[PDB]
């Protein structure tokens, strides 16, 4: 039916069959990435043509391939061999993570390092992390993972409490070789346990928390049709899911009167990077591109009712491919529900004697993923008043290290001898805009202070200025909280009743962007993270701010490459890329398990409607 | 019992009796302000002495007085005559707002202005606004109000939709004379009505919203004793109420194990100013000091259950004095309840096999007030993890004007010919700190970027720096969102188990501060609003950032004067004053009644605890 429906188990199995038939999926092949492609711009095919893009890895060392197939037609549209040393390695395979600890367990260098620390190899867990790109020439064209050790005292023990500092190893997960073992010296391994379910640490559980019952007697106010099409309080959209990006929102539109007005064609978190700021050689290479290197959707959690999602929840169970092309369901991976959101509008008028109060509510679409020690929640909200918001929730267990005897300028102490390297969690939201259609433009709006004098004799006046970003070369912007800087996306060809172009205003949190030196590997690989806002001309192959292949890939692809085309963005099909994130200096309160910290952004209508769009909300 | 208990109707009746018998409350006297005084530093003296502070106005022109009485002993502790021309006029009386429209009704100049516009004087409402201090020497020492006109077509009509621009009058509310009527020219009066309950405008009401039921089968998890003492999930505090500041939180403390640890001695919104940025002479003088000039607590609304506050609500009905000393109860003026706040902490560990999820909740204490056209909600939040937060919700009807032909750089258009002058809503949160006691200090923390080179070969390192504010002369700080600037309040004499001073970190939203020219009257009268954070040494008489008598004060009062003392704040009894607000360029969406917009701040524990304080929270 709808070309925006979720991929089905059948479609995935069919893709597997098409690839096998084409001789592209033999025993040595593995699917590193598989996802359905969005319909092309404009009414092309007389009907729908469901296409899937796949990244195929070869465990024998042969070059991988990027393939696009039409599941509808049963054909391979294109198949290209990839030169990874140039364009990037494919995302890490879940099966390659296990390899690291296994290989190191029998490596003489690794064993000697553990022995020097009096550690039992059988109790040493190894965190298999992405390698990035540095000065190791032998790594070019190879699939490498770097391992950091943590001691697990017993089966249910939290290894993160026992980091083994001064040690790191590099492993080629295809040839199954340990390329390097670096030991910079022994550090005491923190002894205190971080078992947050241990009664001795938690103490008696409080019994003071009375129940909060949230229910909907007549069911939810939103409807779900076609499996993933949502209709709620005038909003209309399709909830998609991609193994790389996770939840993706399509065709966000608002029913204004008798017309369905588009606002955002596609909204997603196109990349997420977690750069560490500890200069120690043991972790100075540490940078997680959770989305681009690991694929966050793949690790989405099954959400439990009453615990993860409270109230009347409607679940979606997206299907993804496993390493062999077989479909795998992520049961209850997406939660959908509406929640009360306090007061919407209120006024008690003396002159008219009318007292008016209305309540607000929001539609929530979310999922939670786990990448090693961290767990991130991705939340999208739609409000009655037309506001759209995204919120990321960061929790889990902080990545640890030893805490240096003489303190540290890049690590904080969580417990005796236990340290937490400073780092950031930076996201990139890709917003393929469609304010009342595809003809859009972006204006940077700053508050303008005025000088006391002629025409402003009392010095109370203040104004605002808007600068249209006309070409991609002028569209790489930075925040300016001091001047209340925001960015407005409007449609110069669609005006409200007051003859002004309709628009939506993006309000950022103005948190610090990437802190790394501009000459670092990470500043180049995560270039998008160095600026708050980027605007590009829409293009089918410009999907991620870091390009298609992020794993062990240097600069050269992504946003910097796209912007160079210097295309016209003044009243055209454009895409907004907003960078936002948290800078983390772990506190003692973040140990042994950290309470949620959040960050996000929102867009509010700006002259999009002819008056408040919530005057028809009942008193209830 | 508790010296922090809410005032009783009887205590107010006692003050009235005391003043009366003392001959301080004659027929010409009016109580402009009345509130109970907080206990002085140190209460080692058994049995407190309930004292009340009172501002007495005289309608015959006689000198006003500031009186302090003891309801415990039934005596007048002090009574001092005020020289308003020097120290400022008393707050505006509710009965004075009425005289403006009434007086103008029979003034020839006013009638001539209305006749030229063909407006029925009986239909013209006049907004009685504070006057401030400008170039009118004859106003020094006199109580003046400036009036702006709005047409009300019928009893239930919203006059705000029909502003009468080009006209303004000044009135002496004591001598009851119209000192001036300024008519700069006729402007069309906007014709469209803004009646949000008129089916003609709202259209058919939605029938799509299903109910959301929030209940607590076993009641709330918090306990209320002594009338206003709250105990909830380890938190302890007293909820007070003042006619000027509104809800005030006292003795906020956290039960950590066996110790009841203080965090903040007193928290309140000590001032809220709404400066307008329209250079027109009709409004260039407009600046509302809602707290200081009008007294926000006085206009607190009676909150309806299931309407203003949903769920299991526990109300407090504070009592205030009327203009004659009579007790007046504000039925259900304060809402108190706890609400679910999503995920608190979550981690699914591969190695231990332990999947952990805990939910969060917050304690809410709030009230809503109405000042003419606007309505503001003040919300204080206490979270399980120790976070303290404040949030202001701004709604109501936008103050209007005509929208000039040709447009405007200082007014936005809401409807045909209807304008909305630009303005700001700036709050000042006075936080009398008590981090583990009164010996505190403040440090400004900035993120520090590092250059690639020796000791940072990969250029990935980044750090932080903290600067102690030692004297008041260096305690006037500005925000720096780009460098992630925050402020930490710590106790240098109380250290956590890691030998680090315990503390709390204030996170600001970094919204723009006062925009007016530095030499403007408003910049001098609301100097607190020009900088984000101020730190002062505690003093009994330093209550408001704008001084005790804000109305028609020439400027420089409050914070600027306090800071000038240049006292030692490095490890002393200090007070933090945080400025935060919204800069409003009204959108079409804000008309005819505006959807809530918010702003606030929060403080999070920073090494205050020895580990996460929510490990004892049950799974449920
Ligand atoms: Cu973190
Ligand atoms: Cu406003």
mmCIF file of C-alpha atoms in Angstrom, chain A residues 101 125-127 134-136 150 152 155-157 159-160 170 192 196-197 201-202 204-206 208-221 233-234 275-279 281 284-285 301 303 306-310 338-349 351-352 354 356-357 359 361 368 370 372-375 379 384-385 393 395-397 409-410 413-416 422-424 445 447 449-452 455-456 458-464 478-479 481-484 496-498 509-512 514-521 583 585 587-589 591-597 602 604-618 620, chain B residues 101 125-127 134-136 150 152 155-157 159-160 170 192 196-197 201-202 204-206 208-221 233-234 275-279 281 284-285 301 303 306-310 338 340-349 351-352 354 356-357 359 361 368 370 372-375 379 384-385 393 395-397 409-410 412-416 422-424 445 447 449-452 455-456 458-464 478-484 496-498 510-512 514-521 583 585 587-589 591-597 602 604-618 620:
data_model
loop_
_atom_site.group_PDB
_atom_site.id
_atom_site.type_symbol
_atom_site.label_atom_id
_atom_site.label_comp_id
_atom_site.label_asym_id
_atom_site.label_seq_id
_atom_site.Cartn_x
_atom_site.Cartn_y
_atom_site.Cartn_z
ATOM 1 C CA UNK A 101 38.562 -11.032 23.341
ATOM 2 C CA UNK A 125 36.428 -8.805 29.390
ATOM 3 C CA UNK A 126 37.533 -6.793 26.372
ATOM 4 C CA UNK A 127 35.535 -3.883 24.997
ATOM 5 C CA UNK A 134 45.538 7.375 12.897
ATOM 6 C CA UNK A 135 49.246 6.803 12.189
ATOM 7 C CA UNK A 136 49.177 3.030 11.716
ATOM 8 C CA UNK A 150 37.936 -4.606 32.176
ATOM 9 C CA UNK A 152 34.732 -9.105 35.725
ATOM 10 C CA UNK A 155 29.235 -13.720 36.087
ATOM 11 C CA UNK A 156 26.927 -10.950 37.348
ATOM 12 C CA UNK A 157 29.721 -8.458 38.088
ATOM 13 C CA UNK A 159 33.247 -5.094 34.646
ATOM 14 C CA UNK A 160 33.161 -1.333 34.075
ATOM 15 C CA UNK A 170 44.650 -3.676 17.991
ATOM 16 C CA UNK A 192 35.328 -1.439 44.482
ATOM 17 C CA UNK A 196 23.877 -1.428 41.412
ATOM 18 C CA UNK A 197 21.580 -4.357 42.211
ATOM 19 C CA UNK A 201 25.522 -1.014 47.786
ATOM 20 C CA UNK A 202 21.889 0.004 47.296
ATOM 21 C CA UNK A 204 17.318 -1.325 51.749
ATOM 22 C CA UNK A 205 15.121 -0.305 48.819
ATOM 23 C CA UNK A 206 12.861 2.626 49.672
ATOM 24 C CA UNK A 208 8.007 5.387 50.149
ATOM 25 C CA UNK A 209 7.056 5.412 46.465
ATOM 26 C CA UNK A 210 3.298 5.143 45.980
ATOM 27 C CA UNK A 211 1.888 4.096 42.578
ATOM 28 C CA UNK A 212 1.139 6.543 39.768
ATOM 29 C CA UNK A 213 -1.562 5.093 37.532
ATOM 30 C CA UNK A 214 -1.741 6.411 33.980
ATOM 31 C CA UNK A 215 -4.519 4.972 31.856
ATOM 32 C CA UNK A 216 -6.800 5.820 28.954
ATOM 33 C CA UNK A 217 -10.318 4.390 29.569
ATOM 34 C CA UNK A 218 -11.370 4.901 25.945
ATOM 35 C CA UNK A 219 -8.001 4.080 24.398
ATOM 36 C CA UNK A 220 -5.448 6.459 22.775
ATOM 37 C CA UNK A 221 -6.454 9.493 20.683
ATOM 38 C CA UNK A 233 -4.652 15.760 16.791
ATOM 39 C CA UNK A 234 -4.285 17.094 13.235
ATOM 40 C CA UNK A 275 34.663 11.703 21.141
ATOM 41 C CA UNK A 276 36.876 11.217 24.191
ATOM 42 C CA UNK A 277 39.163 13.963 25.480
ATOM 43 C CA UNK A 278 41.782 11.972 27.400
ATOM 44 C CA UNK A 279 45.222 12.399 25.759
ATOM 45 C CA UNK A 281 47.606 6.753 24.275
ATOM 46 C CA UNK A 284 43.247 9.043 22.626
ATOM 47 C CA UNK A 285 41.911 7.157 19.578
ATOM 48 C CA UNK A 301 16.007 -2.670 23.083
ATOM 49 C CA UNK A 303 10.761 -2.066 25.623
ATOM 50 C CA UNK A 306 5.066 -0.173 32.646
ATOM 51 C CA UNK A 307 8.836 0.059 32.973
ATOM 52 C CA UNK A 308 10.200 1.619 29.780
ATOM 53 C CA UNK A 309 6.909 2.971 28.454
ATOM 54 C CA UNK A 310 4.141 3.830 30.930
ATOM 55 C CA UNK A 338 0.322 10.419 23.991
ATOM 56 C CA UNK A 339 0.845 12.170 27.305
ATOM 57 C CA UNK A 340 -0.588 15.109 29.178
ATOM 58 C CA UNK A 341 1.666 18.136 28.960
ATOM 59 C CA UNK A 342 0.338 20.614 31.508
ATOM 60 C CA UNK A 343 -1.282 23.923 30.618
ATOM 61 C CA UNK A 344 -1.655 24.788 26.927
ATOM 62 C CA UNK A 345 -3.194 28.251 27.223
ATOM 63 C CA UNK A 346 -4.709 30.222 30.072
ATOM 64 C CA UNK A 347 -6.151 33.653 30.779
ATOM 65 C CA UNK A 348 -8.432 35.147 33.412
ATOM 66 C CA UNK A 349 -9.793 38.405 31.998
ATOM 67 C CA UNK A 351 -12.836 43.182 31.730
ATOM 68 C CA UNK A 352 -14.688 40.328 30.014
ATOM 69 C CA UNK A 354 -14.050 35.173 31.151
ATOM 70 C CA UNK A 356 -10.167 30.280 30.189
ATOM 71 C CA UNK A 357 -7.870 27.278 30.638
ATOM 72 C CA UNK A 359 -4.530 21.587 28.676
ATOM 73 C CA UNK A 361 -0.579 17.055 25.323
ATOM 74 C CA UNK A 368 16.140 2.920 23.252
ATOM 75 C CA UNK A 370 22.443 -0.100 23.928
ATOM 76 C CA UNK A 372 28.363 -1.484 25.070
ATOM 77 C CA UNK A 373 28.267 0.491 28.334
ATOM 78 C CA UNK A 374 25.924 3.243 27.120
ATOM 79 C CA UNK A 375 22.197 3.291 26.550
ATOM 80 C CA UNK A 379 12.372 10.668 21.602
ATOM 81 C CA UNK A 384 -0.987 20.298 19.917
ATOM 82 C CA UNK A 385 0.301 23.792 19.103
ATOM 83 C CA UNK A 393 18.330 10.680 26.799
ATOM 84 C CA UNK A 395 22.205 6.853 30.537
ATOM 85 C CA UNK A 396 23.964 3.545 31.186
ATOM 86 C CA UNK A 397 27.394 3.102 32.793
ATOM 87 C CA UNK A 409 42.936 17.642 33.624
ATOM 88 C CA UNK A 410 41.043 15.214 31.382
ATOM 89 C CA UNK A 413 37.318 10.631 39.854
ATOM 90 C CA UNK A 414 34.207 8.528 40.509
ATOM 91 C CA UNK A 415 35.533 6.318 43.286
ATOM 92 C CA UNK A 416 38.894 5.345 44.830
ATOM 93 C CA UNK A 422 35.976 13.492 29.652
ATOM 94 C CA UNK A 423 34.004 13.168 26.417
ATOM 95 C CA UNK A 424 31.084 14.517 24.398
ATOM 96 C CA UNK A 445 17.606 35.462 12.870
ATOM 97 C CA UNK A 447 18.112 39.893 18.058
ATOM 98 C CA UNK A 449 20.207 45.920 20.020
ATOM 99 C CA UNK A 450 19.732 49.608 19.294
ATOM 100 C CA UNK A 451 21.617 52.680 20.453
ATOM 101 C CA UNK A 452 19.884 55.410 22.427
ATOM 102 C CA UNK A 455 14.262 57.785 16.966
ATOM 103 C CA UNK A 456 15.088 55.940 20.196
ATOM 104 C CA UNK A 458 14.674 56.592 25.708
ATOM 105 C CA UNK A 459 16.978 53.780 24.613
ATOM 106 C CA UNK A 460 14.367 51.060 25.097
ATOM 107 C CA UNK A 461 14.051 49.910 21.491
ATOM 108 C CA UNK A 462 15.333 46.554 20.278
ATOM 109 C CA UNK A 463 14.731 44.724 17.020
ATOM 110 C CA UNK A 464 15.593 41.608 15.020
ATOM 111 C CA UNK A 478 27.367 28.700 14.353
ATOM 112 C CA UNK A 479 25.229 29.404 17.390
ATOM 113 C CA UNK A 481 23.032 32.398 22.321
ATOM 114 C CA UNK A 482 23.949 35.923 23.420
ATOM 115 C CA UNK A 483 22.019 37.385 20.471
ATOM 116 C CA UNK A 484 19.210 34.827 20.649
ATOM 117 C CA UNK A 496 -0.218 33.434 5.483
ATOM 118 C CA UNK A 497 -3.236 35.753 5.563
ATOM 119 C CA UNK A 498 -1.011 38.645 6.616
ATOM 120 C CA UNK A 509 20.038 24.495 23.083
ATOM 121 C CA UNK A 510 23.318 26.147 22.114
ATOM 122 C CA UNK A 511 25.517 23.563 23.833
ATOM 123 C CA UNK A 512 29.235 23.433 22.970
ATOM 124 C CA UNK A 514 33.124 19.546 18.932
ATOM 125 C CA UNK A 515 36.012 20.583 21.194
ATOM 126 C CA UNK A 516 38.876 18.708 19.495
ATOM 127 C CA UNK A 517 41.696 20.615 17.825
ATOM 128 C CA UNK A 518 40.702 21.444 14.221
ATOM 129 C CA UNK A 519 43.734 19.506 13.008
ATOM 130 C CA UNK A 520 42.747 16.255 14.711
ATOM 131 C CA UNK A 521 41.578 13.103 12.973
ATOM 132 C CA UNK A 583 29.819 17.740 27.008
ATOM 133 C CA UNK A 585 32.679 15.709 32.857
ATOM 134 C CA UNK A 587 30.333 13.324 38.407
ATOM 135 C CA UNK A 588 30.421 10.971 41.367
ATOM 136 C CA UNK A 589 26.634 10.993 41.034
ATOM 137 C CA UNK A 591 28.485 6.206 39.291
ATOM 138 C CA UNK A 592 27.791 3.220 39.452
ATOM 139 C CA UNK A 593 25.005 3.813 36.918
ATOM 140 C CA UNK A 594 24.149 7.248 35.590
ATOM 141 C CA UNK A 595 20.817 9.051 35.892
ATOM 142 C CA UNK A 596 19.473 10.306 32.572
ATOM 143 C CA UNK A 597 20.894 13.529 31.119
ATOM 144 C CA UNK A 602 12.644 22.007 18.758
ATOM 145 C CA UNK A 604 7.914 26.090 16.501
ATOM 146 C CA UNK A 605 5.602 27.475 13.835
ATOM 147 C CA UNK A 606 6.453 31.063 12.874
ATOM 148 C CA UNK A 607 3.587 32.616 10.960
ATOM 149 C CA UNK A 608 2.786 29.167 9.544
ATOM 150 C CA UNK A 609 -0.821 29.428 10.736
ATOM 151 C CA UNK A 610 -3.220 32.377 10.401
ATOM 152 C CA UNK A 611 -3.847 32.365 14.169
ATOM 153 C CA UNK A 612 -3.395 29.943 17.068
ATOM 154 C CA UNK A 613 -4.079 26.406 15.767
ATOM 155 C CA UNK A 614 -5.487 25.245 19.113
ATOM 156 C CA UNK A 615 -8.596 27.388 19.548
ATOM 157 C CA UNK A 616 -10.704 24.303 18.780
ATOM 158 C CA UNK A 617 -9.381 22.387 21.783
ATOM 159 C CA UNK A 618 -12.223 21.604 24.255
ATOM 160 C CA UNK A 620 -12.763 18.663 28.721
ATOM 161 C CA UNK B 101 -10.307 54.937 33.553
ATOM 162 C CA UNK B 125 -11.206 50.276 28.873
ATOM 163 C CA UNK B 126 -7.974 51.751 30.181
ATOM 164 C CA UNK B 127 -5.000 49.654 31.216
ATOM 165 C CA UNK B 134 11.568 59.682 32.763
ATOM 166 C CA UNK B 135 11.791 63.395 31.883
ATOM 167 C CA UNK B 136 8.777 64.608 33.874
ATOM 168 C CA UNK B 150 -8.572 49.406 24.427
ATOM 169 C CA UNK B 152 -14.505 46.543 24.454
ATOM 170 C CA UNK B 155 -19.317 42.791 28.198
ATOM 171 C CA UNK B 156 -17.704 39.505 27.111
ATOM 172 C CA UNK B 157 -15.505 41.083 24.416
ATOM 173 C CA UNK B 159 -10.599 44.496 24.551
ATOM 174 C CA UNK B 160 -6.992 43.553 23.721
ATOM 175 C CA UNK B 170 -0.700 60.240 32.717
ATOM 176 C CA UNK B 192 -11.347 41.864 14.172
ATOM 177 C CA UNK B 196 -11.372 32.666 21.696
ATOM 178 C CA UNK B 197 -14.601 31.172 23.067
ATOM 179 C CA UNK B 201 -13.564 31.896 15.631
ATOM 180 C CA UNK B 202 -12.797 28.511 17.187
ATOM 181 C CA UNK B 204 -16.289 23.229 15.692
ATOM 182 C CA UNK B 205 -14.515 21.933 18.806
ATOM 183 C CA UNK B 206 -12.475 18.733 18.491
ATOM 184 C CA UNK B 208 -10.788 13.549 18.934
ATOM 185 C CA UNK B 209 -9.170 13.845 22.359
ATOM 186 C CA UNK B 210 -9.667 10.720 24.444
ATOM 187 C CA UNK B 211 -9.263 11.056 28.217
ATOM 188 C CA UNK B 212 -6.000 10.529 30.067
ATOM 189 C CA UNK B 213 -6.489 9.389 33.646
ATOM 190 C CA UNK B 214 -3.772 10.103 36.197
ATOM 191 C CA UNK B 215 -4.514 8.677 39.634
ATOM 192 C CA UNK B 216 -2.800 7.448 42.774
ATOM 193 C CA UNK B 217 -4.669 4.455 44.345
ATOM 194 C CA UNK B 218 -2.715 4.715 47.598
ATOM 195 C CA UNK B 219 -2.474 8.491 47.655
ATOM 196 C CA UNK B 220 0.628 10.709 47.173
ATOM 197 C CA UNK B 221 4.149 9.690 48.165
ATOM 198 C CA UNK B 233 11.586 10.961 48.464
ATOM 199 C CA UNK B 234 14.334 12.184 50.805
ATOM 200 C CA UNK B 275 10.399 45.785 29.259
ATOM 201 C CA UNK B 276 8.927 46.886 25.931
ATOM 202 C CA UNK B 277 11.111 47.692 22.943
ATOM 203 C CA UNK B 278 8.782 49.890 20.888
ATOM 204 C CA UNK B 279 10.265 53.416 20.537
ATOM 205 C CA UNK B 281 6.160 57.678 22.745
ATOM 206 C CA UNK B 284 8.458 53.711 25.163
ATOM 207 C CA UNK B 285 7.955 54.116 28.938
ATOM 208 C CA UNK B 301 -5.499 32.340 40.647
ATOM 209 C CA UNK B 303 -6.553 26.537 40.581
ATOM 210 C CA UNK B 306 -8.585 18.340 36.821
ATOM 211 C CA UNK B 307 -8.137 21.630 34.990
ATOM 212 C CA UNK B 308 -5.140 23.637 36.196
ATOM 213 C CA UNK B 309 -3.670 20.747 38.172
ATOM 214 C CA UNK B 310 -4.292 17.152 37.077
ATOM 215 C CA UNK B 338 4.267 14.310 42.222
ATOM 216 C CA UNK B 340 6.124 10.447 36.619
ATOM 217 C CA UNK B 341 9.148 11.736 34.728
ATOM 218 C CA UNK B 342 10.090 8.883 32.414
ATOM 219 C CA UNK B 343 13.275 6.841 32.676
ATOM 220 C CA UNK B 344 15.636 7.644 35.560
ATOM 221 C CA UNK B 345 18.441 5.207 34.717
ATOM 222 C CA UNK B 346 18.768 2.263 32.366
ATOM 223 C CA UNK B 347 21.397 -0.223 31.242
ATOM 224 C CA UNK B 348 21.321 -3.626 29.585
ATOM 225 C CA UNK B 349 24.692 -5.242 30.201
ATOM 226 C CA UNK B 351 28.665 -9.248 30.163
ATOM 227 C CA UNK B 352 26.655 -9.444 33.397
ATOM 228 C CA UNK B 354 21.656 -7.854 33.976
ATOM 229 C CA UNK B 356 18.181 -2.650 34.626
ATOM 230 C CA UNK B 357 15.539 0.070 34.322
ATOM 231 C CA UNK B 359 11.680 5.317 36.468
ATOM 232 C CA UNK B 361 9.492 11.273 39.200
ATOM 233 C CA UNK B 368 -0.535 30.754 38.524
ATOM 234 C CA UNK B 370 -2.711 37.093 36.314
ATOM 235 C CA UNK B 372 -3.777 42.379 33.310
ATOM 236 C CA UNK B 373 -3.385 40.686 29.935
ATOM 237 C CA UNK B 374 -0.735 38.123 30.898
ATOM 238 C CA UNK B 375 -0.873 35.022 33.040
ATOM 239 C CA UNK B 379 6.741 25.886 38.907
ATOM 240 C CA UNK B 384 14.700 11.871 42.652
ATOM 241 C CA UNK B 385 18.342 12.332 41.627
ATOM 242 C CA UNK B 393 5.149 29.341 31.911
ATOM 243 C CA UNK B 395 0.614 32.683 28.511
ATOM 244 C CA UNK B 396 -2.399 34.996 28.389
ATOM 245 C CA UNK B 397 -3.129 37.604 25.710
ATOM 246 C CA UNK B 409 11.224 47.143 13.197
ATOM 247 C CA UNK B 410 9.814 46.941 16.740
ATOM 248 C CA UNK B 412 4.989 42.369 14.703
ATOM 249 C CA UNK B 413 1.607 41.911 12.992
ATOM 250 C CA UNK B 414 -0.883 39.490 14.580
ATOM 251 C CA UNK B 415 -4.022 40.260 12.578
ATOM 252 C CA UNK B 416 -5.104 42.969 10.105
ATOM 253 C CA UNK B 422 8.499 43.483 20.978
ATOM 254 C CA UNK B 423 9.334 42.934 24.651
ATOM 255 C CA UNK B 424 11.056 40.635 27.131
ATOM 256 C CA UNK B 445 33.318 26.760 35.234
ATOM 257 C CA UNK B 447 35.127 24.264 29.127
ATOM 258 C CA UNK B 449 39.857 23.627 24.502
ATOM 259 C CA UNK B 450 43.423 22.410 24.053
ATOM 260 C CA UNK B 451 45.874 22.816 21.205
ATOM 261 C CA UNK B 452 47.308 19.816 19.388
ATOM 262 C CA UNK B 455 51.107 16.103 25.631
ATOM 263 C CA UNK B 456 48.203 16.168 23.161
ATOM 264 C CA UNK B 458 46.322 13.649 18.555
ATOM 265 C CA UNK B 459 44.591 16.910 19.423
ATOM 266 C CA UNK B 460 41.633 15.185 21.082
ATOM 267 C CA UNK B 461 42.090 16.507 24.599
ATOM 268 C CA UNK B 462 39.816 19.049 26.229
ATOM 269 C CA UNK B 463 39.489 20.178 29.812
ATOM 270 C CA UNK B 464 37.688 22.569 32.137
ATOM 271 C CA UNK B 478 27.667 36.823 32.088
ATOM 272 C CA UNK B 479 26.766 33.629 30.262
ATOM 273 C CA UNK B 480 29.011 31.986 27.668
ATOM 274 C CA UNK B 481 27.078 29.153 26.037
ATOM 275 C CA UNK B 482 29.863 28.539 23.515
ATOM 276 C CA UNK B 483 32.262 27.524 26.303
ATOM 277 C CA UNK B 484 29.580 25.671 28.251
ATOM 278 C CA UNK B 496 32.760 14.038 49.821
ATOM 279 C CA UNK B 497 34.447 10.660 50.292
ATOM 280 C CA UNK B 498 36.833 11.568 47.466
ATOM 281 C CA UNK B 510 21.605 31.193 28.254
ATOM 282 C CA UNK B 511 18.738 33.267 26.843
ATOM 283 C CA UNK B 512 19.461 36.925 25.975
ATOM 284 C CA UNK B 514 18.171 42.951 28.960
ATOM 285 C CA UNK B 515 18.492 44.430 25.461
ATOM 286 C CA UNK B 516 17.813 48.106 26.226
ATOM 287 C CA UNK B 517 20.596 50.670 25.810
ATOM 288 C CA UNK B 518 22.956 50.747 28.853
ATOM 289 C CA UNK B 519 22.044 54.372 29.539
ATOM 290 C CA UNK B 520 18.274 53.841 29.520
ATOM 291 C CA UNK B 521 16.075 54.258 32.580
ATOM 292 C CA UNK B 583 12.710 37.682 24.346
ATOM 293 C CA UNK B 585 8.652 38.820 19.015
ATOM 294 C CA UNK B 587 3.876 35.418 16.233
ATOM 295 C CA UNK B 588 0.502 35.111 14.550
ATOM 296 C CA UNK B 589 0.249 31.843 16.486
ATOM 297 C CA UNK B 591 -3.102 35.468 18.800
ATOM 298 C CA UNK B 592 -5.926 35.585 20.011
ATOM 299 C CA UNK B 593 -4.624 33.782 23.109
ATOM 300 C CA UNK B 594 -1.081 32.514 23.369
ATOM 301 C CA UNK B 595 0.087 28.925 23.852
ATOM 302 C CA UNK B 596 2.482 28.526 26.769
ATOM 303 C CA UNK B 597 6.157 29.352 26.226
ATOM 304 C CA UNK B 602 18.156 24.020 37.199
ATOM 305 C CA UNK B 604 22.317 19.467 39.660
ATOM 306 C CA UNK B 605 24.415 17.834 42.393
ATOM 307 C CA UNK B 606 28.138 18.082 41.626
ATOM 308 C CA UNK B 607 30.033 15.722 43.889
ATOM 309 C CA UNK B 608 27.498 16.475 46.632
ATOM 310 C CA UNK B 609 26.859 12.754 47.134
ATOM 311 C CA UNK B 610 29.383 9.893 47.361
ATOM 312 C CA UNK B 611 27.656 8.034 44.524
ATOM 313 C CA UNK B 612 24.271 8.055 42.800
ATOM 314 C CA UNK B 613 21.591 8.880 45.402
ATOM 315 C CA UNK B 614 18.961 6.811 43.589
ATOM 316 C CA UNK B 615 20.397 3.309 43.892
ATOM 317 C CA UNK B 616 17.751 2.508 46.514
ATOM 318 C CA UNK B 617 14.847 3.145 44.131
ATOM 319 C CA UNK B 618 12.759 -0.044 43.593
ATOM 320 C CA UNK B 620 8.320 -1.527 40.285
#
